[PDB]
Nucleic acid binder design. Structure first.
Ligand SMILES: [K+]
Ligand SMILES: [K+]
Ligand SMILES: [Mg+2]
Ligand SMILES: [Mg+2]
Ligand SMILES: [Mg+2]
Ligand SMILES: [Mg+2]
Ligand SMILES: [Mg+2]
Ligand SMILES: [Mg+2]
Ligand SMILES: [Mg+2]
Ligand SMILES: [Mg+2]
Ligand SMILES: [Mg+2]
Ligand SMILES: [Mg+2]
Ligand SMILES: [Mg+2]
Ligand SMILES: [Mg+2]
Ligand SMILES: [Mg+2]
Lengths: 158, 353, 193, 98, 52
RNA sequence: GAGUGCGUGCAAUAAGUUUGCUUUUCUGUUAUAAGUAAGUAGACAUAUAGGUUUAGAUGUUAUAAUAGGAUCCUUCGUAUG
RNA sequence: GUCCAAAUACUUGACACAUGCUAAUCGAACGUUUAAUUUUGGCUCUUAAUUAAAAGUGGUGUACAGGUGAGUAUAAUAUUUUUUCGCUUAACUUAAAGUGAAGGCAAAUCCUUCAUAUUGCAAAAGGAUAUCUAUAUCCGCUUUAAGAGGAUGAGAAAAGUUUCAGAGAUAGGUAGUUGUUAAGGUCAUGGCUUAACAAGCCAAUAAUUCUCUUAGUCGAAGCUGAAAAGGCUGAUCGACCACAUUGGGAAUGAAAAAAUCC
């Protein structure tokens, strides 16, 4: 009820080639294919694009063919994830850390997000409880004075 | 709007000292702009005000304002107003109340609830009823509100006493009757006299100040002393016109005033409890004070009303007088000898004089 | 169809009507020979007589239709009017033993309020009793304690046209600036002589 | 403040109005949110009719007009009258009988 | 209004007007939405039919 | 030789303005201090009276801490050279 | 060169301007004054009022309408389509609840503060008109839940679109800048924010920056061609941008969106 689940939607799959790797942790530059239409010449031009794909377990090396999927937003400039390796480079696929399935990656977001809310409800209650105690002490010092000053008057009427 | 408060008529040296004190520190600062008033009382600007003290263009020669220690320099207003009040012994002295009470109204000094009743007693016993009726008229300036049930009962007493002082002569009785109505008109219409204190006292009596049997009996007294003299026709037009009011006010007082209820039983028993609300009536010295003319009125009214052929009113009014006379007699024995109450009642009701 | 409403005691003739609604309409009082001519003539017939400008003619046609509907202005429901001057008085009642009700009633100047009966004791709308002996209401000049009168003043019913204070909200700082220059030039001039 | 008002179009001495849904504080002839209908003040006469009667042709989308009135649209004095004749609102002015 | 659901008559001349205007906007909103909903259902039905 | 509504460097700079090992100041609560000025409470007594007297529960005044907002200085900054 | 209707009418010096007008309105927000009118008091002066005009204080509106094309050279947190959303204390619709106490100015529905408002923080303002032989209405104010509207949050994600003036020069640009871990923030997402590490990210044919010349932009809106994603114009029409003598700036406000203000 209070937890927000990720979309968990499957987008298209693109086949590309890793251009760079090992420069930044859990990130590689993949080059996919594209094509743009020139309305003036009525001609299609090749429009190759290079994105920053999310390699969770650092299982990609420059030169391997991979299949990526968009919609997986991990950072400001990272909107793509690695789905699987089409053709490895250097070493076989069995000698690299496994690529987590999209379900495992999504579960990490839900688990991490759900845990984040559990910390807030505790921090909010403790913050509200630790403050109500101080506000409850002002009543004490203010109540003893009234009870000490109001009973005095009442003690001279009976 | 109004001229700056100033006192330039003091018969005694002590009176001037009490007014000059309040005037130069409690009244005058009320004429300065708000920012300058705060500066006067600030310790940080003490040295600055010494070199170049604030000034005021007051009818010529200017005043000066140095630093005023709010705790030590400021004088006790209730005490000074007392010293000035007691010292007042000449008409020129009492004329300062118009400026004094105006200054406190500007300073927002919540004066003692009973103070008004005191000014009306000391000023009227000296023969200055007009100064009171003049301030009671100019309440927008002086702040002489008729909020207390004692002030109204005290003011109406001296009004009648002045008429009775000269055997209830027609020239003065017409003037007194004019004043009693000018007050009952203010209590009803004028809003300056309505405050939280009044609403509380009107709730304890269940009779507004303008429909209180104790006060309506004052008007009925003078009206009863006008038909008595006559009951040339240019004067008879008034006599025949006064008989209509007498029978009118009489039947109005009998309706409000319950049956066989004296002055101490008229209002709710819970009214005489609080000392700030209608407790003065308990003391026999003060009861006979406000029960002298109120009793004589019913007696004379029941007599005149009886000659015109009004059986019911004749019996009704006598019922009240019988109830007040019985209670009044109890006060004569309880009151201490030599008290003002025992004297006035002896001179009005007893007629010993 | 163009019904004519009967004249009221407060508006007996046309010269009175055109005087109340103001806007300099008392100039064309002679154009209307009778009281029916006012409520019978049309726009075209009011234009040939010389009822100009168009604002005054349209303003008259409005108050003309406003009179048929009994939507009079102030003091339009009076009955005891004498030569264009009415008198107001207070009628005190007894709503309760501790209260009084005061209503501003219109009676002849001589008769007393208590003497008048309910039928002829009219209660004027728009005037109220302040205090105990004050008659508050537009165009209520006091004569005695609890007595006032309504003199038929020009423009008593008129809808005042708005006016510009000192040349409007746009040309205000300029008009006052130029007045000061003219004022200063005439104080300095007298100094020369 | 949405309003159902008229936008004057046409030529000199040939008025033709357009019922529109526009914000109060906008130009009279600016492009509104919608065009509910049209209004022609000059009454016409049937072609082959000699009775002398006259009619005023008005095109109005009653369905669209009702929705805007239900959300708080304020029709002007002229459009209020038209809507009253159709039966959507109550007349604002009536001929005094007395 | 609570006073209307309780079957109470209008208090003043102005209350009667507010009651009529408020009800006019209620019936207009109902007939408006429904009347416009059928247009949508009728429009997209013609599109899907012609396109199919 | 004449002109410049152009760009730019330094100096200077009104309104305005970043920052703080600045300078005053107001307000807000928090904890105290006072009860003389005010204001709010209680006790006793007086009588053509309304006086004496103690008290801080709201509130007033003062200090301290603390939060925040305006001033001064600082930095930047049209004109101008 | 006879008559009539409609439609257009400073394309140049955003050159300088005589004169009258384009934003005012509410007395059912508020008192100040001046006049008469009526009341006091003391014997013309002096109190308390009523009334009418004239200046104002306040509330709302000048953020709309109308005018102009000087400046301005663009790819942008720009824009459509689908999915998912968020905010909105003014005004417009529906309803509910609350509308009490002081001080300052001459007074106030103006300012300052307070009590109360599911728990705990957090509001308000009064005015006016009838009835009776105090009661109930009317116009407001504050708060709250919704609808509509909106110039709304950098909304987000996926897939797309935008003919970017002409000439010359410049190879670096980016420093929360790019990514990871952890935490906060957010409806959600994003260095959005911070700590600690890593040295990345965009670009290489000009990304980026600089100088000069010229220009308001667009639309079957106008003109034109048989036609081209045609060409030209950017008057009247509608949308957008900028400006109000030139330059340099801020606040108020729901929102600058002013011919305002400094
Ligand atoms: K410099
Ligand atoms: K331009
Ligand atoms: Mg190819
Ligand atoms: Mg410098
Ligand atoms: Mg500076
Ligand atoms: Mg003291
Ligand atoms: Mg220094
Ligand atoms: Mg310079
Ligand atoms: Mg031009
Ligand atoms: Mg504009
Ligand atoms: Mg109130
Ligand atoms: Mg798609
Ligand atoms: Mg950034
Ligand atoms: Mg140009
Ligand atoms: Mg243009």
């Amino acid at each position: 009820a209070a937890a927000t689940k990720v979309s968990r939607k499957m987008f298209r799959e693109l086949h590309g080639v890793v251009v760079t790797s090992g420069l930044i942790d859990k990130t590689v530059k993949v080059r996919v294919g594209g094509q743009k239409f020139n309305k003036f010449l009525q001609k299609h031009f090749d429009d190759p694009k290079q994105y920053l794909v999310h390699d969770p377990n650092n299982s990609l090396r420059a030169g391997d063919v991979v299949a990526i999927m968009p919609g997986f937003i991990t950072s400001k400039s990272k909107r793509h994830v690695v789905k699987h390796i089409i053709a490895p480079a250097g070493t076989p696929i069995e000698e690299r850390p496994p690529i987590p399935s999209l379900d495992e990656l999504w579960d990490a977001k839900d688990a991490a997000k759900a845990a984040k809310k559990e910390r807030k409800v505790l921090r909010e209650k403790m913050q509200a409880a630790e403050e109500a105690i101080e506000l409850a002490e002002r009543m004490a010092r203010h109540a003893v004075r009234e009870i000490a000053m109001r009973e005095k008057i009442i003690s001279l009427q009976k | 709007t109004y001229p700056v408060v100033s006192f330039n008529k003091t018969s005694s040296p002590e009176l001037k000292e009490a007014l000059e004190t309040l005037r130069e520190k409690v009244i005058l600062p009320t004429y300065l702009p708000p920012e300058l008033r705060q500066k006067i009382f600030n310790k940080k600007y003490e040295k600055e005000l010494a070199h170049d003290p604030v000034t005021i263009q007051i009818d010529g020669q200017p005043q000066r304002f140095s630093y005023i220690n709010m705790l030590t320099d400021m004088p006790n207003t209730p005490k000074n107003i007392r010293a000035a009040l007691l010292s007042m012994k000449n008409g020129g002295d009492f004329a300062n109340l118009s400026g004094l009470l105006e200054g406190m109204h500007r300073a927002n000094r919540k004066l003692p609830y009973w103070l008004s009743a005191q000014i009306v007693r000391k000023a009227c016993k000296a023969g200055h009823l007009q100064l009171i009726l003049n301030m009671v008229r100019d309440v927008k300036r002086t702040g002489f509100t008729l909020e207390r049930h004692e002030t109204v009962n005290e003011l109406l007493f001296w009004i009648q006493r002045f008429a009775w002082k000269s055997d209830y002569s027609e020239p003065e009785t017409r003037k007194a009757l004019r004043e009693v109505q000018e007050i009952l008109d203010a209590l009803e219409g004028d809003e300056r006299h309505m405050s939280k204190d009044r609403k509380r006292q009107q709730a304890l009596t269940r009779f507004p100040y303008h429909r209180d049997p104790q006060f309506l009996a004052a008007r009925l007294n003078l009206t009863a002393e006008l038909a008595a003299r006559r009951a040339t026709s240019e004067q008879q037009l008034n006599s025949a016109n006064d008989v209509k009011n007498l029978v009118k006010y009489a039947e109005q007082l009998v309706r409000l005033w319950p049956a066989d209820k004296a002055l101490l039983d008229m209002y709710t028993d819970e009214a005489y409890v609080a000392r700030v609300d209608l407790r003065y009536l308990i003391k026999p010295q003060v009861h006979l004070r406000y029960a002298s003319f109120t009793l004589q009125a019913l007696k004379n009214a029941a007599k005149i009303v009886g000659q015109l052929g009004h059986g019911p009113l004749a019996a009704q009014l006598i019922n009240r007088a019988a109830a007040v006379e019985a209670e009044s007699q109890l006060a004569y024995a309880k009151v201490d000898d030599g008290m003002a109450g025992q004297k006035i009642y002896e001179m009005v009701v007893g007629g010993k004089k | 169809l163009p019904l004519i409403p009967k004249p009221t005691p407060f508006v007996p003739d046309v010269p009175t009507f055109l005087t109340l609604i103001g806007r300099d309409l008392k100039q064309h009082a002679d154009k209307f020979p009778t009281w029916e001519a006012l409520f019978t003539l049309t726009t075209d017939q009011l234009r040939e007589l010389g009822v100009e400008p168009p604002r005054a003619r349209r303003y008259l046609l409005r108050w003309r239709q406003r009179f048929r509907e009994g939507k009079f202005g102030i003091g339009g429901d009076l009955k005891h009017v004498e030569n264009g001057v009415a008198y107001l008085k207070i009628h005190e009642k007894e709503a309760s033993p501790t209260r009084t009700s005061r209503r501003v009633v219109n009676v002849p100047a001589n008769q007393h309020v208590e003497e008048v009966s309910e039928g002829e004791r009219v209660k004027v709308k728009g005037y109220k009793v302040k205090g105990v002996s004050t008659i508050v209401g537009p165009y209520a000049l006091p004569v005695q304690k609890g007595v006032a009168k309504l003199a038929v003043t020009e423009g008593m019913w008129e809808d005042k046209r708005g006016h510009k204070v000192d040349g409007g909200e746009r040309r205000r700082a300029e008009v006052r600036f130029k007045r000061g220059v003219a004022e200063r030039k005439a104080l300095r001039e007298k100094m020369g002589f | 403040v949405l309003k159902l008002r008229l936008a004057r179009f046409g030529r000199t001495n040939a008025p033709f109005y357009n019922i529109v849904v526009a914000h109060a504080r906008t130009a009279r002839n600016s492009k509104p949110l919608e065009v509910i209908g049209t209004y022609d003040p000059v009454p016409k006469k049937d072609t082959y009719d000699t009775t002398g009667k006259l009619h005023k042709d008005i095109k109005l989308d009653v369905t669209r007009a009702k929705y805007w009135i239900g959300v708080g649209a304020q029709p002007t004095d002229t459009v209020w009258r038209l809507l009253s004749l159709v039966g959507i609102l109550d007349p604002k002015y009536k001929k005094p009988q007395p | 209004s609570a006073a209307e659901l309780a079957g109470l008559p209008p208090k003043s001349k102005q209350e009667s007007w507010r009651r009529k205007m408020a009800e006019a906007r209620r019936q207009s909103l109902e007939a408006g939405l429904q009347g416009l909903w059928q247009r949508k259902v009728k429009r997209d039905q013609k599109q899907a039919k012609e396109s199919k």
